[PDB]
């Protein structure tokens, strides 16, 4: 439960 990383998919 966190914002996805910049490297995370769509």
């Amino acid at each position, epitope marked *: 439960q*966190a914002p*996805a*990383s910049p*490297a*995370a*998919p769509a």
Partner: antibody
Amino acid sequence: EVQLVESGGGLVQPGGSLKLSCAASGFTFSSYGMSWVRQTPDKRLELVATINSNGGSTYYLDSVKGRFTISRDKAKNTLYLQMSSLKSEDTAMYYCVRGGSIYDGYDYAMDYWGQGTSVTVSS
Amino acid sequence: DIVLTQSPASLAVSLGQRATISCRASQSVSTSSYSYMHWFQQKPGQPPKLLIKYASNLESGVPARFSGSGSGTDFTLNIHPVEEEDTATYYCQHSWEIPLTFGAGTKLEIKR
């Protein structure tokens, strides 16, 4: 209390087929991405497949692409892993896991694991 | 793909003392706000259990003797004071990118 109960594992012939089931309770199933993680006899953990909360996004381990399908049924709060063209390398304990989804701008950790269902690929 | 390297493979820690387990990622898994590293405990005959999420967040209901730290490539799991029930294999896992991967595990023996 979160509960994840796997079934459908067991002995299956090389080239054969099984469908694993995971009954989820104690949370709003549709709100969570879900994963299958396997543990091989060497005790290594490897993520096999992930499905996002709604079912529109799926990930597969390269070595199971075209062999395995992850799906979910909102009616039954049930997660599935269809396993086809089974190989010796697929012998493992298969865990149903809440989370492991980094889709849709949100990261949800692998916070609940079932007791697991055993698969043995052998003639 | 990211590779996670744990060290050591195994260790024995006297009852009441500190166990320190390391995980190194092949590339950074941190922004300036979040580190995408997690820690699991696998007790004998049990599935993995989440201890720490996003490097330093104690998983709700997990005892305070467990803590996580680190940023970029280098992460630590600290257990202090160790107790008998802490005998287990411990794993790290990142959620930086597809694919999600695990370290190969560190076996903790409690020394009595």
